[PDB]
Design a protein around this ligand. Structure first.
Ligand SMILES: [Mg+2]
Ligand SMILES: [Mg+2]
Ligand SMILES: [Mg+2]
Ligand SMILES: [Mg+2]
Ligand SMILES: [Mg+2]
Ligand SMILES: [Mg+2]
Ligand SMILES: [Mg+2]
Ligand SMILES: [Mg+2]
Ligand SMILES: [Mg+2]
Ligand SMILES: [Mg+2]
Ligand SMILES: [Mg+2]
Ligand SMILES: [Mg+2]
Ligand SMILES: [Mg+2]
Ligand SMILES: [Mg+2]
Ligand SMILES: [Mg+2]
Ligand SMILES: [Mg+2]
Ligand SMILES: [Mg+2]
Ligand SMILES: [Mg+2]
Ligand code: NA
Ligand code: NA
Ligand code: NA
Lengths: 49, 197, 66
RNA sequence: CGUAAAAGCUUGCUUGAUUAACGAUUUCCAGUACGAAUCGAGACUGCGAAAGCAAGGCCAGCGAUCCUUUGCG
RNA sequence: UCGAACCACCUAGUAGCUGGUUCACAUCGAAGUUUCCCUCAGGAUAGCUGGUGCUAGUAGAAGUAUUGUGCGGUAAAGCGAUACUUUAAAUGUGCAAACAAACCGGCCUUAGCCAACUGCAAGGCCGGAAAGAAAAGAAUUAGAGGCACCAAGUGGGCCUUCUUCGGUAAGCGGAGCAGGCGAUGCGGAAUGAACCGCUUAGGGAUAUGUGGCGUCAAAACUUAUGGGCUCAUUCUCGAUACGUAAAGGGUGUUGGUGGCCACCGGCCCCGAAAAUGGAUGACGCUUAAGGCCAAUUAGUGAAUGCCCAUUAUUCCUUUGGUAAGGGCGGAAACGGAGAAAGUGUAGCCCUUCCGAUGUAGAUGUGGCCUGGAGGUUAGGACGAAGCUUAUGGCGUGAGCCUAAGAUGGACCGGCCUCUAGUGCAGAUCUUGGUUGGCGUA
RNA sequence: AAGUUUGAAAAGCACUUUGGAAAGAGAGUGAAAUAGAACCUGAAGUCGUGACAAAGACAAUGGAAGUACCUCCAUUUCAAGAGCCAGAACCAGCCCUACUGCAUUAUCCUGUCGGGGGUCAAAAUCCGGCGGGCAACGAAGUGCAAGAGGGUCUUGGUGAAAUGAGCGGAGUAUUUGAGCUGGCACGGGCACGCACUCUUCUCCGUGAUGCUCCAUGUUGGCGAUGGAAAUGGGGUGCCCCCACCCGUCUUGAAACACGGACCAAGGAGUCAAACAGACGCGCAAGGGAGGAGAUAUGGCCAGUACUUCUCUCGUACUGAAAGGGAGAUGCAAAAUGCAUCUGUGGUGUGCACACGUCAAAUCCGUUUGAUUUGCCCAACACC
């Protein structure tokens, strides 16, 4: 819960928070999910042939 | 609650303060508590621990025993070093069985009058702990010694004398009284002298 | 009038624990052993004590030399 | 319980059912004694060609102080 | 006064038997079992408990696993009789798993074994090696080992779980293993020594356990946007375990198997007969407030509906430790004061961590109180002791101190040592005085 | 049984008035008559009277938490004052509710063909062929999840050293992820393991010549010296909840088990002697008397000061007794051997000290542990 204690124990937590906010951004999520589904189905279709 | 079954059996019984009424003993305890707390030496800690014990647990030592152990230490010493100071937290008594001794420096709580005379006439020196703290404040170049406890009549009386393997003396004022059935084969039986383990 | 039971006895015996046996190297007396071997071992031990005294004298002399 | 060229049966010779420097141990158990038993060292012997086996009949069959009485030096 | 008078004395005769035994807090805390006894309402003895320590503080540890290696004849199985036994578990039980140990090569000694020793046995000395115990699921520890001394209480037990022997059976007698009560409350089962939950310094907050959520009575102000089943007329449908009714019937109603039938279920109804009026705890409840199952605000789309402990988490204060750290040569100047080398206090001063219930019993306490002695320091006719109290203050407490007397009239308080005829609620206790019954018989 | 203990002194109550008297009401003595004759003090228990509080039957008593009324009690505040009682704000901490992505979907979704079904006709529930695929706005109630507003009459404070991503200085970049990029691993190509464009804020700072304790905001109400206000304590009643009678023997007591009307004063582990352990004190191979004497000494003075030569316990034990009686080393083998005398009889385990090594920390010169070697004190084990 504490901001000061958490940062004192793990100096790296701010970068993790940055990554979290980036991943929760709506446009990034939409593009990532759309692109990921294409990346998977295409790869499965190619590999099964 | 917490399951702490039988945790009181791990506590140990140790003495923190002296029962003695001697003001000079109190002054010595004050000095050596200071030294043991503020110095790294193990000598000061052991000396402080021994100053708090009871009279029965500070057995007196003999001058002849001091001489013998000092000689055994000396035969393997580089002959360019000085001999250590003998240090006993207790009383030093004289021994009529040994006439000739070398010259030694001995620090003790109390000396017999004849023992002090013998040490000085041999060329040695008697010392108090307050002078020892000035000469050797960390206990460097010392020989710490203890007196003998076994040999006391009270120790020789401990335990039952009627069980096999025991050689303790009974509590009896008439020495000829308990010398019969139980101690001779010609009577009913004899207490066995030896038993394994 | 004459009751017998073992009900609380194991609980009593485990308060100060069942103590383990004394190690094998202590109290290792030979009394009651087969006699001829005992008699020979005694002679060997006497010779060994003589040798120990001689060795100490030699060490003392060597240290005195250097 | 155990045992088959035996631990049973017949037979020959024998007295280890003696003595055994206060050795050690098990069972009961307080880890006391008594009774019974196990592993021994020494003497004198028995049986056997020999290695060996035997100080009773495996395991129930027995008893303090004091007093009386016998043996021994 | 007689199955052995009365008076005084030996005589306070003896009692393994009955009754009593006077202040506080703190740290710890049992046993009803073994052996022997003219020994069964008693002792001694070991065990369990307290105190004191000694010793080189992680050692020679373990009511527990793993791996390796031994032991076993009960359950089950089988066929004497018409249960004895080849086989054989689960749960057990002994030993070992690198620091006084074991492994590899020098050598010394023995009036040990062997035909002999360059072999074997034993005790030592000199050297080497050492993942200090790998990898293969390849231990763990609120894991400091050992050794003494002195002494108490107890030696009537009882209940339960799983095994059981006697007995027709018993809230009956006798045993094995473990847990309890006794010695213990608290929260639940309406109530109950022993069941369920939880085990206890003085107090807040949050959350839970067992048990609950129609009223009594905190919680679904009688929740759901869940499914089935059930109607019971003078003890009566039913409804919190431990805990106080059977065969057989029923077209009452709801379903299942095989062939409109035969059988098997679920609830309900007969079967079901006692002594004061009375008990799902009471009232009552039937689109349940019953019985089985299942949810958490409901086919919306995402972990916890709600209520109640001396438990859990956390915060404040006390007390004690086998406790753990730090400061204590007055820095200088001149917001306040203080600052002791210390077992114990109004604790020398700060900081930190963990424990706290208890009968019989042990021990500690600069712990409380009473009469007298040696010292020291004070008080009193401007009023000592004693006595009275909606006189407050201090102390966890035993108690201490002040105030007022519209009480009294001459002795006495604190502190350190010493000493004892030294503390009362109860003994059909002793002595004195009161008292209800009672203005009664 | 029973203190005659009134008072300094009998000054022991003249006189008036009511009454048969005892006595009462006045008056007087005395410092005091609530010191008036069995007369100092004058407790408890029990009883009378006056005032007050209430109160059903719930026996009474008792616990906890409030309130009404009282209070010969204590303490604190009254004007620029923080004393008492309120409200709001901010800071630290703690506790609640906010804000959330990745994997997996196939026994599924969708279009045709054939069957089968049923209707007044045709659709669907259902089955088998092959064409595609994401049920994707709240699609799963599948597994794992990381994302400042409200309390603190559940805490402390108002900056008397605020350690802060939160208070300050400096710039605008840094580097976290997501897409997309170029040897080995993974499977029979790579869904993107191992090595070398969107998305966010970054760096720097205050030691204690402060060992400990206490003293620091804002806005109102009340309090301007009183029969004051306020806080705490004490008393009595009431309400809701809780709550079996003490001591004792007993496995088990609230017991239909024994003792128990009230109060005062009295009432039970003591003194002596023998032994032992633990703790305090003196001396120590020695310790200590006792009885008695001597002279300071001839209420102080039954005390204190001094003392021999004896006695007792111990320094040695063992045997029924006649009796005998304990060092070490080297040579040697004598049924009383010989020689030296600064010395643990030996072995294993074993404080401190000395000599070196190793590991950890350190204004970093030294600590804290482990360990080799020497001597090993006490002690234990085997000889
Ligand atoms: Mg023989
Ligand atoms: Mg006779
Ligand atoms: Mg008559
Ligand atoms: Mg008497
Ligand atoms: Mg009598
Ligand atoms: Mg009694
Ligand atoms: Mg306890
Ligand atoms: Mg009785
Ligand atoms: Mg009892
Ligand atoms: Mg309980
Ligand atoms: Mg309610
Ligand atoms: Mg404390
Ligand atoms: Mg307690
Ligand atoms: Mg008395
Ligand atoms: Mg009384
Ligand atoms: Mg009077
Ligand atoms: Mg009772
Ligand atoms: Mg002696
Ligand atoms: Na001795
Ligand atoms: Na009920
Ligand atoms: Na007295």
């Amino acid at each position: 819960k504490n901001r000061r204690l958490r940062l004192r124990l793990n100096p790296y937590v701010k970068r993790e928070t940055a990554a979290a906010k980036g991943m929760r951004n709506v446009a990034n999520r939409d593009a990532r999910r759309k692109a990921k589904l294409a990346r998977v189905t295409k790869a499965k279709k190619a590999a099964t042939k | 609650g917490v399951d702490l079954t039988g945790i009181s059996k791990k506590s140990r019984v140790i003495r923190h303060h002296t029962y003695s009424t001697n003001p000079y003993i109190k002054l010595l305890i004050k000095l050596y508590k200071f030294l043991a707390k503020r110095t790294s030496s193990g000598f000061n800690k052991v000396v402080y621990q021994r100053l708090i014990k009871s009279r029965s647990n500070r057995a007196p030592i003999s001058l002849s025993r001091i001489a013998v152990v000092m000689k055994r230490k000396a035969v393997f010493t580089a002959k360019s070093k000085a001999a250590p100071i003998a240090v006993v937290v207790g009383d030093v008594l004289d021994d009529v069985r040994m006439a000739r001794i070398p010259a030694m420096r001995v620090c003790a709580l109390r000396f017999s009058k004849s023992a002090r005379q013998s040490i000085v006439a041999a060329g040695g020196e008697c010392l108090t702990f307050d002078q020892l703290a000035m000469i050797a404040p960390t206990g460097k170049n010392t020989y710490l010694l203890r007196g003998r406890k076994s040999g006391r009549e009270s120790v020789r009386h401990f335990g039952a004398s009627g069980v096999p393997g025991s050689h303790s003396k009974p509590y009896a004022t008439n020495r000829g009284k308990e010398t019969k059935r139980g101690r001779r084969t010609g009577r009913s039986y004899k207490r066995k002298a030896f038993r394994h383990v | 009038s004459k009751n017998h039971t073992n009900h609380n006895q194991s609980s009593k015996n485990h308060r100060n624990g069942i103590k383990g046996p004394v190690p094998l190297h202590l109290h290792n007396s030979k009394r009651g052993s087969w006699l001829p071997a005992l008699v020979n071992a005694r002679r060997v031990r006497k010779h060994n004590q003589k040798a120990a005294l001689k060795k100490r004298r030699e060490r003392i002399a060597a240290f005195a030399a250097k």
